[PDB]
């Protein structure tokens, strides 16, 4: 349904949800650099962009009961950020004890212990609990097994609450199941063949699904009663599903739904049945289900407009000729870009600044002439749809509707 697109030269390598009981669901995502961007879920705009005080952010992990948040910087720090007071509010609470490793992945246990795997090999366990004498201090630096020809670095670590363990996955494939109290290795697996990049579990931790860079997603189990009497994990099932990679995974359960969703560097989205991983009928998603469309056509001049990111390309039919290609540098994150019922007026949308050109076809190339519409350039546009050949309608990012070259609507209950 909803796309929130940021334009040229910005990424996201981590995000998480916050849903306290009774208030608005919020996304906290990262960019490439040192800001937790708290997005709105109203109209696709970042309502807060907390520049975190330390380093360059590498991973978020929300806390249970959703009042605290952990980010892991690159100088070595792990920063706790308090988020309480509904939306818009973000305050730095504390940074925990520094070290000299690029902190790669974080996960809470409860409101108390933050487990963080770091780029030396070691996974460390900081404590951060109110009213207790060791706040901000770590407790243990458990150490994963290294390799000589390559810097081994743990890419992910999650907590397992039923059997009080932490699962770690690293850059030798060695998925290791550490015990939490007494802080050492319960068991190990050299199951994978290359860098393990993510993993997850279910709500009562009978399963751990790991997935790496050689795309072999496999599922360790603890299902039988004697295996949970021993609380020991087996290397139960394997599955290859992908073409190139996995770079993230997630799982969900209910009493009517239970499935795993994974994705990698081939751009699709693969869904398996969770509790029946060896049995389940998986499903591949198509790489584009363009419910916000990206290419428009028009029957004057038999032409097709195709707008990529911050770039449009127009051609026409007859063979054909790739007529013209425009790039825009003030426009960064593209949106709907609709043409007139004439080969003249092209409106290109961006939720900050949206522009209009008119088009002189001089034959084998076009000529594009910008025209200043400043009410348009200062409003925010989600849909531009061309009522008549000169005047257009515009939706708003604030639930209004106007006419360019005014409109009312009725309210709706909440």
């Amino acid at each position: 349904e909803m796309v929130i697109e940021g334009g040229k030269d910005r990424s996201i390598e981590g995000l998480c949800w916050s849903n306290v009981n009774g208030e608005s669901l919020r996304l906290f995502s990262i960019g490439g650099s040192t800001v937790v961007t708290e997005w709105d879920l109203a109209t696709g705009l970042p309502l807060r962009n907390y520049d975190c005080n330390s380093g360059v952010i590498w991973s978020i992990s929300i806390n249970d009961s959703q009042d605290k948040l952990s980010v892991g910087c690159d100088n070595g720090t792990v920063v706790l950020i308090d988020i309480s007071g509904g939306p818009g509010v973000l305050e730095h609470d504390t940074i925990l004890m520094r070290q000299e490793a690029r902190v790669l992945t974080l996960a809470w246990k409860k409101d108390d212990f933050v487990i963080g795997g770091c780029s030396d090999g070691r996974i460390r366990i900081w404590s951060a609990q109110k009213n207790d004498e060791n706040m901000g201090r770590l407790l243990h630096t458990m150490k994963v097994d290294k390799a000589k020809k390559e810097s081994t670095l743990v890419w992910s670590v999650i907590y397992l609450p039923r059997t009080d363990q932490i699962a770690s996955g690293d850059s030798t494939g060695s998925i290791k199941f550490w015990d939490f109290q007494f802080a050492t290795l319960n068991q190990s697996f050299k199951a994978h063949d290359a860098d393990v990049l993510c993993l997850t579990t279910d709500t009562d931790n009978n399963y751990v699904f790991s997935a790496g860079v050689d795309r072999k997603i496999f599922q360790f189990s603890q299902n039988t009663n004697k295996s949970q009497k021993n609380n020991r994990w087996v290397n139960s099932s394997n599955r290859l599903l992908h073409g190139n990679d996995i770079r993230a995974i997630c799982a969900y359960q209910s009493k009517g739904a239970d499935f795993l969703v994974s994705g990698g560097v081939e751009k699709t989205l693969v869904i398996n049945s969770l509790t029946s991983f060896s049995n389940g009928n998986y499903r591949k998603m198509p790489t584009v289900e363009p419910y916000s469309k990206n290419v428009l056509v028009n029957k004057e001049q038999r032409l097709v407009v195709s707008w990529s990111e911050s770039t449009v390309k127009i051609w026409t039919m007859g063979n054909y000729k790739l007529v013209c290609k425009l790039t825009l540098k003030d426009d960064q994150n593209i949106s709907t870009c609709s043409l007139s019922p004439d080969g003249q007026v092209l409106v290109v949308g961006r939720p900050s600044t949206t522009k209009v050109f008119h088009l002189q076809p001089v034959g084998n190339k076009l000529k594009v002439t910008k025209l200043d519409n400043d009410l348009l350039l200062r409003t925010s546009t989600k849909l531009v749809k061309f009522i008549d050949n000169s005047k257009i309608v515009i939706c708003s990012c604030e639930d209004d509707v106007f006419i360019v070259d005014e409109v009312e609507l009725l309210e709706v209950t909440s």
Binding site: G6, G31, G32, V35, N49, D74, E150, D214, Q332, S352
Partner: protein
């Protein structure tokens, strides 16, 4: 007609260079970096992508 186009594009898109002894950086419009907050730190995300396209794996 060969490189004057990208040269004048560079000399309009870059920030200013040291006049005299000291330098001067510009300051962008605040109504640009308010809907897409960071810039991706290329010098470390190229590091993570280099590690994932390591030569040790193939």
């Amino acid at each position: 007609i060969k490189t004057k186009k990208r040269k004048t594009l560079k000399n309009l898109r870059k920030d200013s260079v040291k006049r005299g002894k000291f330098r001067v950086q510009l300051l962008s419009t605040t109504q640009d970096s308010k809907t897409l907050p960071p810039k991706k730190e290329s010098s470390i995300i190229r590091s993570k992508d280099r590690w994932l396209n390591r030569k040790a794996l193939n």
